[PDB]
């Protein structure tokens, strides 16, 4: 039903200084990889899940698209929880990752964990908006932060990157406290449902 | 039933990492050994 | 304006849900001083941008809250501030009483939070204990017992790998403290430059601490000539970052005193403690000649002729003619310079030395020599190429 | 210090990577080398290439995949067991943010210090198009090491 | 008609170095290139191949390790 590639982006900022929301934080994103990989690769073929980091310690590629979720779990290790944030770097790392992959000429999706409003440059996000539209790239923004962070340059990125209907962005707000991270992502359009074209 | 299943999945997956690692090693260790073994005697260890 | 009493109390309730597992005495010490303006270890958030030199009564309070400090703000508050910031309190009643909080307590945190490399950035779990190992004997008795513990920190420096350079320089600050109260400041001047010399990103301190850092650099270059001269700190952001009064001009005074040759100008700006040692006047005359020694490569003569007489160094160093022969013997014997002198024609031809980073007329004469190398390309080179 | 001995096959094949794809100045190729780094004389008996992508206008944009190295190392285990990763090489004289950061990724599979090699694709001037450098800190300081060309008996003939 | 193989100086040296060590020891390698039947023949890149228990054979070629090298050799043009 849905054939797409998933790219997990790890972005941190000064708003990420909280390390435990209910009993933990940033440790739930490790276990959520198993639920995302099982609901995509094991559910239907031609669905691959990669991992990159555009902020925190170093803006590098943690793990590329593989056939198992264990290699993605090794990429999440050795990652600074509090560090610098670069928005324009994470978008270019995924574009180079999605350029070389298996089963080309398909739909592409980027799943980014956004803990901060990400205020850097307005014109830089506009020039990078039309770049991802030509390759049919779907950038999904998940908000954690402190309660809800919106009505800023973060939401301006969603409206500026959308020429089509389902191929660009989906908003998901995670409520702090004892909440299931994989359940809010599964019920969201991020996993299967809409976005396929 | 709750915490044990979280750590069991990590050890079970790591056991599969060495499983695929030895799977190619089992094929090499058996094939690299020459089946027509020749009689020999070691004079000094 | 109260950062700890008001800003720290309000923001502590909003961060980490409701409170970071605060104790009923958290608001007790805040209302203790009231308007007395005693911050006393502002405890993480406020403490980052706010410093407290007062003697804290909460030293043993937040030690159990370290588990909540990581999930609230950062884990660097323990290594940068709090138990490691005790040196700013300047309380003599804590001597050798910090082994529980600053030594034994870190061992309990090493078995829970940071086991090896820790979390977030690196460097945590190393500077914690290693900073207070040498500081044990830096107070109380003589520094002799502290030197035996300095080698243990140098062994861990090569084994451990830390991204920030402040941990490596922190081990050099303890080595420099050993030579601060001891003579032969040449070794003290070498260890002082290791802490901060040219490094921009490391050794981040306030403006008031830059003057005290240059104070140790002012007394280090007095009794020894090693590693260039007072002119080396001029290029580095040290001399230009301090004030020219309050006996901080000792670097500036002796810089121009080499060409002038007047000891009474520097003697009037100092005290009797450092002016009663003849070594100060003995090694100062070397830098007066060392400036002339730098002229033996390319300065005046463009023929590459190295010549230095006794008359040029006699008026510059304020020394008589009979002591010129005895001055050269003391320089080679102490390892200051190498070479030989001519006692017949009264000439000096030296050996390998340490030329400074100076420029202008120096680089102007060195580039003109390379032109002579290039002019010989048009002279000897064109003849051999055609033949 | 240490020494670096590079076989003539590595320096000959590294320059060929530039002409085949007609790479412009906006892209710079990166590759890996093999040998024994345990001794004081670094010997390079093998070399490979990597699908490295880089942006010229942005020094913060680079792409390097370590999974291709894992599948390649498993192939060498059935060929030569004495070949391990001693470092990596890149193309172009310029050292930018993309070139200095990727040196740490190869330190995971390399026990000793990865050898740094700056390949000149235009071979302009003097000899030795690829200089051998070592990474050491007191800020990363790259020091020049003596470069010698020595090969085996069958390779030189 | 018979082909005339033109081997580049780079590929000729690699094939000699891979099959170098030892008299009894046998190895195997793969040759790459792009040429057309009758003339135009050439050899671009060559690299060693993993050896099975039978030594030189058809089943000793591993397409798993070979497919990973295709994306690696494509960046520098070595893929053929």
mmCIF file of C-alpha atoms in Angstrom, chain C residues 87-319:
data_model
loop_
_atom_site.group_PDB
_atom_site.id
_atom_site.type_symbol
_atom_site.label_atom_id
_atom_site.label_comp_id
_atom_site.label_asym_id
_atom_site.label_seq_id
_atom_site.Cartn_x
_atom_site.Cartn_y
_atom_site.Cartn_z
ATOM 1 C CA UNK C 87 38.420 26.629 45.283
ATOM 2 C CA UNK C 88 36.548 29.918 44.745
ATOM 3 C CA UNK C 89 35.085 29.868 48.273
ATOM 4 C CA UNK C 90 38.504 30.495 49.893
ATOM 5 C CA UNK C 91 37.535 28.838 53.186
ATOM 6 C CA UNK C 92 40.470 27.495 55.201
ATOM 7 C CA UNK C 93 38.201 25.485 57.529
ATOM 8 C CA UNK C 94 37.640 22.928 54.734
ATOM 9 C CA UNK C 95 41.287 21.802 54.583
ATOM 10 C CA UNK C 96 41.410 18.015 54.061
ATOM 11 C CA UNK C 97 37.678 17.815 54.864
ATOM 12 C CA UNK C 98 36.614 17.461 51.211
ATOM 13 C CA UNK C 99 37.675 13.815 50.816
ATOM 14 C CA UNK C 100 34.046 12.801 51.387
ATOM 15 C CA UNK C 101 32.420 15.208 48.918
ATOM 16 C CA UNK C 102 35.252 15.824 46.431
ATOM 17 C CA UNK C 103 36.748 12.311 46.465
ATOM 18 C CA UNK C 104 34.576 9.601 48.025
ATOM 19 C CA UNK C 105 31.350 11.055 46.609
ATOM 20 C CA UNK C 106 32.748 10.971 43.064
ATOM 21 C CA UNK C 107 33.392 7.234 43.447
ATOM 22 C CA UNK C 108 29.687 6.713 44.162
ATOM 23 C CA UNK C 109 28.801 8.725 41.046
ATOM 24 C CA UNK C 110 31.282 6.789 38.891
ATOM 25 C CA UNK C 111 29.421 3.534 39.630
ATOM 26 C CA UNK C 112 26.031 4.998 38.648
ATOM 27 C CA UNK C 113 26.014 7.892 36.172
ATOM 28 C CA UNK C 114 29.331 7.972 34.275
ATOM 29 C CA UNK C 115 30.964 4.541 34.299
ATOM 30 C CA UNK C 116 33.630 5.101 31.628
ATOM 31 C CA UNK C 117 32.965 7.767 28.984
ATOM 32 C CA UNK C 118 29.727 9.010 30.546
ATOM 33 C CA UNK C 119 26.997 10.669 28.498
ATOM 34 C CA UNK C 120 26.594 13.795 26.343
ATOM 35 C CA UNK C 121 30.119 15.210 25.848
ATOM 36 C CA UNK C 122 33.370 13.625 27.027
ATOM 37 C CA UNK C 123 35.751 14.577 29.821
ATOM 38 C CA UNK C 124 33.305 13.766 32.629
ATOM 39 C CA UNK C 125 34.549 11.329 35.253
ATOM 40 C CA UNK C 126 38.217 12.325 34.830
ATOM 41 C CA UNK C 127 38.748 15.958 35.885
ATOM 42 C CA UNK C 128 36.467 15.280 38.885
ATOM 43 C CA UNK C 129 38.897 13.262 41.008
ATOM 44 C CA UNK C 130 42.115 14.125 39.157
ATOM 45 C CA UNK C 131 41.796 17.838 39.952
ATOM 46 C CA UNK C 132 41.725 17.262 43.727
ATOM 47 C CA UNK C 133 44.477 14.616 43.819
ATOM 48 C CA UNK C 134 47.285 17.169 43.537
ATOM 49 C CA UNK C 135 45.362 19.840 45.478
ATOM 50 C CA UNK C 136 45.581 17.646 48.596
ATOM 51 C CA UNK C 137 49.185 18.630 49.372
ATOM 52 C CA UNK C 138 49.152 22.020 47.614
ATOM 53 C CA UNK C 139 47.986 23.386 50.993
ATOM 54 C CA UNK C 140 49.014 22.624 54.588
ATOM 55 C CA UNK C 141 52.549 21.195 54.486
ATOM 56 C CA UNK C 142 55.247 21.843 51.899
ATOM 57 C CA UNK C 143 54.777 21.134 48.195
ATOM 58 C CA UNK C 144 57.394 18.344 48.281
ATOM 59 C CA UNK C 145 54.706 15.764 49.073
ATOM 60 C CA UNK C 146 52.577 17.127 46.213
ATOM 61 C CA UNK C 147 55.233 16.409 43.572
ATOM 62 C CA UNK C 148 54.971 12.649 44.147
ATOM 63 C CA UNK C 149 51.272 12.857 43.219
ATOM 64 C CA UNK C 150 51.913 14.984 40.112
ATOM 65 C CA UNK C 151 53.420 12.059 38.187
ATOM 66 C CA UNK C 152 50.267 9.986 38.724
ATOM 67 C CA UNK C 153 48.240 12.680 36.947
ATOM 68 C CA UNK C 154 50.678 12.775 34.020
ATOM 69 C CA UNK C 155 50.366 9.007 33.551
ATOM 70 C CA UNK C 156 46.576 9.308 33.305
ATOM 71 C CA UNK C 157 46.938 12.192 30.832
ATOM 72 C CA UNK C 158 48.414 9.997 28.090
ATOM 73 C CA UNK C 159 46.068 7.076 28.810
ATOM 74 C CA UNK C 160 42.830 9.077 28.928
ATOM 75 C CA UNK C 161 41.548 10.904 25.847
ATOM 76 C CA UNK C 162 39.394 14.004 26.348
ATOM 77 C CA UNK C 163 38.008 16.327 23.669
ATOM 78 C CA UNK C 164 38.323 19.569 25.706
ATOM 79 C CA UNK C 165 41.831 20.858 26.364
ATOM 80 C CA UNK C 166 41.023 22.347 29.783
ATOM 81 C CA UNK C 167 41.598 18.972 31.461
ATOM 82 C CA UNK C 168 45.090 18.670 29.971
ATOM 83 C CA UNK C 169 45.915 22.242 31.001
ATOM 84 C CA UNK C 170 44.487 21.577 34.473
ATOM 85 C CA UNK C 171 47.261 19.033 35.057
ATOM 86 C CA UNK C 172 49.801 21.694 34.064
ATOM 87 C CA UNK C 173 48.324 24.170 36.556
ATOM 88 C CA UNK C 174 49.099 21.756 39.399
ATOM 89 C CA UNK C 175 52.660 21.304 38.119
ATOM 90 C CA UNK C 176 53.121 25.081 37.972
ATOM 91 C CA UNK C 177 51.831 25.468 41.538
ATOM 92 C CA UNK C 178 54.756 23.338 42.744
ATOM 93 C CA UNK C 179 57.325 25.768 41.301
ATOM 94 C CA UNK C 180 55.445 28.923 42.346
ATOM 95 C CA UNK C 181 56.947 29.044 45.856
ATOM 96 C CA UNK C 182 60.244 27.466 44.729
ATOM 97 C CA UNK C 183 63.254 29.092 43.095
ATOM 98 C CA UNK C 184 64.401 28.548 39.492
ATOM 99 C CA UNK C 185 61.348 30.055 37.818
ATOM 100 C CA UNK C 186 62.613 28.816 34.436
ATOM 101 C CA UNK C 187 60.777 25.562 35.150
ATOM 102 C CA UNK C 188 57.872 27.634 36.483
ATOM 103 C CA UNK C 189 57.826 29.742 33.308
ATOM 104 C CA UNK C 190 57.728 26.589 31.171
ATOM 105 C CA UNK C 191 54.823 25.060 33.107
ATOM 106 C CA UNK C 192 52.962 28.390 33.176
ATOM 107 C CA UNK C 193 52.898 28.623 29.374
ATOM 108 C CA UNK C 194 51.543 25.063 29.177
ATOM 109 C CA UNK C 195 48.353 26.100 30.989
ATOM 110 C CA UNK C 196 47.606 29.070 28.717
ATOM 111 C CA UNK C 197 49.917 30.526 26.098
ATOM 112 C CA UNK C 198 48.580 30.852 22.540
ATOM 113 C CA UNK C 199 45.410 28.771 22.899
ATOM 114 C CA UNK C 200 42.194 30.623 22.082
ATOM 115 C CA UNK C 201 39.563 27.876 22.626
ATOM 116 C CA UNK C 202 40.860 26.551 25.956
ATOM 117 C CA UNK C 203 41.454 28.240 29.328
ATOM 118 C CA UNK C 204 38.255 30.277 29.491
ATOM 119 C CA UNK C 205 38.511 32.724 32.408
ATOM 120 C CA UNK C 206 37.176 36.149 33.336
ATOM 121 C CA UNK C 207 39.048 39.439 33.013
ATOM 122 C CA UNK C 208 39.974 39.605 36.709
ATOM 123 C CA UNK C 209 41.671 36.194 36.530
ATOM 124 C CA UNK C 210 43.763 37.237 33.517
ATOM 125 C CA UNK C 211 45.645 39.777 35.644
ATOM 126 C CA UNK C 212 46.434 37.176 38.310
ATOM 127 C CA UNK C 213 47.516 34.751 35.579
ATOM 128 C CA UNK C 214 49.905 37.378 34.201
ATOM 129 C CA UNK C 215 51.152 38.027 37.746
ATOM 130 C CA UNK C 216 52.714 34.558 37.799
ATOM 131 C CA UNK C 217 54.058 35.218 34.294
ATOM 132 C CA UNK C 218 55.636 38.464 35.526
ATOM 133 C CA UNK C 219 57.666 36.761 38.276
ATOM 134 C CA UNK C 220 58.529 33.771 36.071
ATOM 135 C CA UNK C 221 60.601 35.764 33.553
ATOM 136 C CA UNK C 222 62.550 37.643 36.247
ATOM 137 C CA UNK C 223 65.168 35.135 37.417
ATOM 138 C CA UNK C 224 65.535 33.265 34.116
ATOM 139 C CA UNK C 225 65.946 33.954 30.408
ATOM 140 C CA UNK C 226 64.566 30.718 28.962
ATOM 141 C CA UNK C 227 61.963 30.540 26.182
ATOM 142 C CA UNK C 228 62.557 33.887 24.408
ATOM 143 C CA UNK C 229 61.967 36.968 26.621
ATOM 144 C CA UNK C 230 59.344 39.461 27.798
ATOM 145 C CA UNK C 231 58.664 40.214 24.124
ATOM 146 C CA UNK C 232 57.096 36.782 23.624
ATOM 147 C CA UNK C 233 54.077 37.613 25.799
ATOM 148 C CA UNK C 234 53.569 40.817 23.786
ATOM 149 C CA UNK C 235 52.357 38.931 20.706
ATOM 150 C CA UNK C 236 50.191 36.602 22.788
ATOM 151 C CA UNK C 237 46.965 38.080 24.221
ATOM 152 C CA UNK C 238 48.507 38.405 27.692
ATOM 153 C CA UNK C 239 50.356 41.700 28.131
ATOM 154 C CA UNK C 240 47.796 43.627 26.072
ATOM 155 C CA UNK C 241 44.935 42.203 28.176
ATOM 156 C CA UNK C 242 46.223 43.444 31.558
ATOM 157 C CA UNK C 243 46.672 46.805 33.301
ATOM 158 C CA UNK C 244 49.874 48.860 33.327
ATOM 159 C CA UNK C 245 49.793 49.739 37.054
ATOM 160 C CA UNK C 246 49.639 47.973 40.443
ATOM 161 C CA UNK C 247 52.964 46.188 39.792
ATOM 162 C CA UNK C 248 51.567 44.489 36.669
ATOM 163 C CA UNK C 249 53.975 46.457 34.437
ATOM 164 C CA UNK C 250 57.013 44.313 35.314
ATOM 165 C CA UNK C 251 56.596 42.700 31.891
ATOM 166 C CA UNK C 252 56.520 46.126 30.211
ATOM 167 C CA UNK C 253 59.278 47.768 32.267
ATOM 168 C CA UNK C 254 61.983 45.157 31.655
ATOM 169 C CA UNK C 255 60.977 44.935 27.979
ATOM 170 C CA UNK C 256 62.247 48.434 27.158
ATOM 171 C CA UNK C 257 64.872 48.358 29.935
ATOM 172 C CA UNK C 258 67.049 46.077 27.786
ATOM 173 C CA UNK C 259 67.919 48.855 25.327
ATOM 174 C CA UNK C 260 67.944 51.626 27.948
ATOM 175 C CA UNK C 261 70.113 49.790 30.467
ATOM 176 C CA UNK C 262 68.831 51.464 33.651
ATOM 177 C CA UNK C 263 68.180 49.133 36.586
ATOM 178 C CA UNK C 264 66.943 51.912 38.892
ATOM 179 C CA UNK C 265 63.774 52.356 36.813
ATOM 180 C CA UNK C 266 62.643 48.781 37.492
ATOM 181 C CA UNK C 267 64.014 48.799 41.050
ATOM 182 C CA UNK C 268 61.779 51.722 42.063
ATOM 183 C CA UNK C 269 58.632 49.904 40.873
ATOM 184 C CA UNK C 270 59.338 46.699 42.840
ATOM 185 C CA UNK C 271 59.790 45.679 46.479
ATOM 186 C CA UNK C 272 62.811 44.630 48.531
ATOM 187 C CA UNK C 273 61.980 40.908 48.299
ATOM 188 C CA UNK C 274 62.847 40.427 44.612
ATOM 189 C CA UNK C 275 65.458 43.215 44.455
ATOM 190 C CA UNK C 276 67.837 41.621 46.991
ATOM 191 C CA UNK C 277 68.741 38.672 44.719
ATOM 192 C CA UNK C 278 71.649 39.324 42.303
ATOM 193 C CA UNK C 279 70.314 36.676 39.890
ATOM 194 C CA UNK C 280 67.717 39.194 38.682
ATOM 195 C CA UNK C 281 70.471 41.540 37.484
ATOM 196 C CA UNK C 282 72.653 38.715 36.130
ATOM 197 C CA UNK C 283 70.097 37.156 33.771
ATOM 198 C CA UNK C 284 68.726 40.555 32.718
ATOM 199 C CA UNK C 285 72.075 41.411 31.107
ATOM 200 C CA UNK C 286 71.808 38.300 28.915
ATOM 201 C CA UNK C 287 68.642 39.489 27.166
ATOM 202 C CA UNK C 288 70.454 42.768 26.503
ATOM 203 C CA UNK C 289 73.146 40.768 24.701
ATOM 204 C CA UNK C 290 70.632 38.248 23.323
ATOM 205 C CA UNK C 291 69.101 41.051 21.250
ATOM 206 C CA UNK C 292 72.592 41.632 19.862
ATOM 207 C CA UNK C 293 73.025 37.863 19.467
ATOM 208 C CA UNK C 294 69.992 37.797 17.156
ATOM 209 C CA UNK C 295 71.902 40.183 14.854
ATOM 210 C CA UNK C 296 74.488 37.507 13.976
ATOM 211 C CA UNK C 297 72.418 35.885 11.206
ATOM 212 C CA UNK C 298 71.249 38.662 8.870
ATOM 213 C CA UNK C 299 70.989 42.240 10.124
ATOM 214 C CA UNK C 300 73.597 44.664 8.763
ATOM 215 C CA UNK C 301 76.101 42.682 6.704
ATOM 216 C CA UNK C 302 74.554 41.243 3.537
ATOM 217 C CA UNK C 303 77.676 39.142 2.842
ATOM 218 C CA UNK C 304 76.634 36.469 5.392
ATOM 219 C CA UNK C 305 79.505 37.378 7.725
ATOM 220 C CA UNK C 306 78.847 36.619 11.398
ATOM 221 C CA UNK C 307 80.794 39.052 13.588
ATOM 222 C CA UNK C 308 80.128 40.362 17.099
ATOM 223 C CA UNK C 309 82.703 42.394 19.015
ATOM 224 C CA UNK C 310 83.055 43.032 22.749
ATOM 225 C CA UNK C 311 82.341 46.772 22.499
ATOM 226 C CA UNK C 312 78.800 46.425 21.132
ATOM 227 C CA UNK C 313 77.805 44.104 23.999
ATOM 228 C CA UNK C 314 79.620 46.140 26.670
ATOM 229 C CA UNK C 315 77.531 49.313 26.365
ATOM 230 C CA UNK C 316 74.254 47.462 25.755
ATOM 231 C CA UNK C 317 74.549 45.107 28.747
ATOM 232 C CA UNK C 318 76.030 47.717 31.144
ATOM 233 C CA UNK C 319 79.057 45.534 31.894
#
